[PDB]
Write a protein that binds this ligand. Structure first.
Ligand SMILES: OC[C@H]1O[C@@H](O[C@H]2[C@H](O)[C@@H](O)[C@H](O[C@@H]3[C@@H](O)[C@H](O[C@H]4[C@H](O)[C@@H](O)[C@H](O[C@H]5[C@H](O)[C@@H](O)[C@H](O[C@H]6[C@H](O)[C@@H](O)[C@H](O[C@@H]7[C@@H](O)[C@H](O[C@H]8[C@H](O)[C@@H](O)[C@H](O)O[C@@H]8CO)O[C@H](CO)[C@H]7O)O[C@@H]6CO)O[C@@H]5CO)O[C@@H]4CO)O[C@H](CO)[C@H]3O)O[C@@H]2CO)[C@H](O)[C@@H](O)[C@@H]1O
Lengths: 207, 207
């Protein structure tokens, strides 16, 4: 059915503010964040499906919302590793591990997607990340010669393809609800950029 | 390689000195070279098997030896597209096409292999080309955790693999006669190299 909660346990950690597997840096220190177990992270057989999602997390002392910035490698199904500023709002940190119920919620954000084009990217091979997205990005495609080509999502929260073609890149993104939106990204470099770079986008998933 | 024989036709072209498919630049402008039909290029099911090979070619007026630098995309079985300085030695330039016989021969070179590490190569993905080899290179393997891993030869005359591991790279090369030599290459970088570079090798195929 429509919007189920997930039972699990929360622990806490100070990692994930920097060097998180989803390459979402910089994370401001006042942000409530979490790492997420692999089974839940990879919903639908899509690697990093929940990367950059937001979760409402309910514990014994209340509820709070966290930004998913990292993998919780040894986490069981249902398990989250929150930042302590988030954890304290829903449980006593003396307890170390707490019972929780969580679910994906609409991101508390404004504006459009922002894209990050990974170092190494070119017309030959590219890795494109979506940031500032209101719901998990389950799918990304690009058009080439009138056909839409699926992009595999990677563990490091970018969508990848090869031989994408020349000129501007028409892309389309699908969320966890199945809503599809469409955008354009400027032509990829002749050859691999030494640095990742940012492209502010011009669409957002519907409310 | 010791013995071999092909019958076909040759034409001639000015291409292949620069920007040839096999990424063998720079080629001296007065070197004797040829482009080669796809069927014979991809001998034994190896893409670009004969890239960087040397052929002895016989026409009506004599024989000469040529360096294979490019693909002859439209050539039929046995067909070659020679540089005009090579065509001149074995045929009448006033003909647009000639009967030829040819065979893979020992490279008229001295010294050991040279490797070219393609731009963007790293421990995660690498494309390695062998240069200055006496016979066609049919196979390249590298060692990883005590096991030998085969690298796919690409159309662009490099061998490719992924997750090659850290540290210096033990490789082994097999020619078209089935001769095998082994060597070591310096470690690959942690991120895609910004520029292609060459590295001196320390072995050569036997005479
Ligand atoms: O999280 C906790 C967990 O951690 C675990 O460890 C993790 C660790 O935490 C992670 O950091 C790490 O994950 C990531 C890692 O996987 C990642 O790997 C990437 C890397 O970043 C990239 O840089 C690299 O990029 C290369 C591509 O892979 C490669 O495929 C691409 O290929 C291109 C070439 O670039 C291009 O030059 C080439 O050549 C062209 C030809 O295409 C062309 O052909 C055409 C002809 O011209 C034309 O005539 C004909 O008609 O058409 C032809 C086309 O069909 O020819 C021209 C010349 O003519 C050539 O120039 O073409 C290729 C096209 O595909 O190049 C890329 C260059 O960058 O990719 C790799 C992946 O492969 O790195 C990141 C770093 O941030 C890392 O995060 O993983 C580890 C391990 O899991 C722990 O294990 C665990 O314990 C913890 O719990």
């Amino acid at each position: 059915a429509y919007d189920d909660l997930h039972e699990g346990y929360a622990t806490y950690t100070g990692s994930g503010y920097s060097g998180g597997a989803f390459l979402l840096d910089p994370i401001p220190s006042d942000m409530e964040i979490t790492a997420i177990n692999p089974a839940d992270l990879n919903y639908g057989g899509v690697k990093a499906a929940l990367a950059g999602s937001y979760l409402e997390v309910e514990g014994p002392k209340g509820k709070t919302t966290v930004y998913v910035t990292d993998l919780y490698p040894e986490g069981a199904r249902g398990a989250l590793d929150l930042s302590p500023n988030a954890f304290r709002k829903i449980g006593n940190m003396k307890d170390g591990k707490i019972n929780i119920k969580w679910r994906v919620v609409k991101a508390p954000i404004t504006g459009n997607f922002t894209y990050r084009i990974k170092e190494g990217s070119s017309r030959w091979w590219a890795a494109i990340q979506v940031r500032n997205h209101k719901y998990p990005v389950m799918k990304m495609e690009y058009e080439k010669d009138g056909k839409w080509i699926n992009m595999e999502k990677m563990d490091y929260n970018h969508f990848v393809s090869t031989n994408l073609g020349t000129g501007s890149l028409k892309v389309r993104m699908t969320d966890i609800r199945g809503k599809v939106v469409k955008d354009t990204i400027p032509k990829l470099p002749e050859s691999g950029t030494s640095k990742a770079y940012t492209v502010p986008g011009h669409v957002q998933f519907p409310e």
